[PDB]
UniProtKB/Swiss-Prot annotation:
One of its GO terms (biological process) is negative regulation of appetite. The gene is PPARA. Its main location: nucleus. Changing residue 105 to A: Reduced heterodimerization with RXRA. Reduced DNA binding. Belongs to the nuclear hormone receptor family. NR1 subfamily. It is found in: Nucleus. Indeglitazar binds at residues 81, 115, 265. Residues 105-234 are annotated as: Required for heterodimerization with RXRA. GO terms for molecular function: DNA binding; DNA-binding transcription activator activity; DNA-binding transcription activator activity, RNA polymerase II-specific; DNA-binding transcription factor activity; DNA-binding transcription factor activity, RNA polymerase II-specific; DNA-binding transcription repressor activity, RNA polymerase II-specific; lipid binding; MDM2/MDM4 family protein binding. GO terms for cellular component: chromatin; nucleoplasm; nucleus. The record marks 234 as: Essential for heterodimerization with RXRA. Ubiquitinated by E3 ubiquitin-protein ligase HUWE1; leading to proteasomal degradation. Residues 40-267 form the NR LBD domain. This is Peroxisome proliferator-activated receptor alpha.
Length: 269
């Protein structure tokens, strides 16, 4: 079309603008074809404490430091998502009609959707062996994550499984931008007031996405349906994650939950 392609572009531009780590900037680091200075590999406890030597500032004033090895990892890992939530909250502005929604419906969308988008985008920085960290400056291996003591070794491995099959779709930021937009405009979230209004808004994004996918990836005929399954998959992935988070709350007495994330997880699933 033309007006649609403008909207699809308006979304993409908001994607690159807000999220500092896109799939292009990431796949080039993992390829190592643009530089000979690879990110610092974190594969065991020694390499971890080395890299942590860089953040000794944020670690001392936060009281972690002497905390357990796993707690330290996923303590800063929370600060990441808190940032991605903010970037996502701003990315939602560009969505046509979103800013107009009732302030309650806006928060509800961003409540049940953020983590579904975080894990989706989180695939862009993963591979079969690990993921990028610190805006591409670090690469934490996948086996080291599976080596932590339970239940921390069950946190990231599920996401790696999704990112491997999801990456297999060969998507570019051009598409993910729209894909993440549709995730936020899901009219299925509990507590939505104007269900009719939101569904109209989502159908616009999905319609744009369905044509964009057929245009940018014409050979993968059922690519659009596959992604719909992925949305369903992510919805399930975030649910299990929420259960595993609350499981860490009812047992681990030395792992505190970030204030912002508390409100998100509160009575989520
Ligand atoms: C992906 C990530 C960081 O996943 C978590 C993994 C571990 C924790 C915790 O260590 C923790 C701390 C306090 C409580 Cl009450 C429960 C769990 C939190 C989130 C997220 O969700 O952004
Ligand atoms: C998260 C957990 C642990 C560390 N660390 O001790 O090396 C770092 C991070 C992290 O995400 N650091 C970061 C984020 C963004 C930009 C630069 C560095
Ligand atoms: C945790 C959640 C999300 C990201 N991310 O996609 O930027 C990274 C991490 C993480 O584990 N960061 C990290 C960096 C350095 C040392 C430990 C942990
Ligand atoms: C955010 C970024 C980096 C670190 N760190 O490596 O010390 C910590 C945090 C952070 O906000 N931790 C936290 C968890 C729970 C409640 C408040 C703060």
């Amino acid at each position: 079309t033309a007006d649609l392609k403008s909207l699809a572009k308006r979304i993409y531009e908001a994607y690159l603008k807000n999220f500092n780590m896109n799939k292009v900037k990431a796949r080039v680091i993992l390829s190592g074809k643009a530089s000979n200075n690879p990110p610092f590999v974190i594969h065991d406890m020694e390499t971890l404490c080395m890299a942590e030597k860089t953040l000794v500032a944020k670690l001392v004033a936060n009281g972690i430091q002497n905390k357990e090895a796993e707690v330290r990892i996923f303590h800063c890992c929370q600060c990441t998502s808190v940032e991605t939530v903010t970037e996502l909250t701003e990315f939602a502005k560009a969505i046509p009609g979103f800013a107009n929604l009732d302030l309650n419906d806006q928060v509800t969308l961003l409540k049940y959707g953020v983590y579904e988008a975080i894990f989706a985008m989180l695939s862009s920085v993963m591979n079969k062996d690990g993921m990028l960290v610190a805006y591409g400056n670090g690469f934490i291996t996948r086996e080291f994550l599976k080596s932590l003591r339970k239940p921390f070794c069950d946190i990231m491995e599920p996401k790696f499984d999704f990112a491997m099959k999801f990456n297999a779709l060969e998507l570019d930021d051009s598409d993910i931008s729209l894909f993440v937009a549709a995730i936020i405009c899901c009219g299925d979230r509990p507590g939505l007031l104007n269900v009719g209004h939101i569904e109209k808004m989502q159908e616009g994004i999905v319609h744009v996405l369905r044509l964009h996918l057929q245009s940018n990836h014409p050979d993968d005929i059922f690519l659009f349906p596959k992604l719909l399954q992925k949305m369903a998959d992510l919805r399930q992935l975030v649910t299990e994650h929420a259960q595993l988070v609350q499981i860490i709350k009812k047992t681990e007495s030395d792992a505190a939950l970030h204030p912002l994330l508390q409100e998100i997880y509160r009575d989520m699933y």
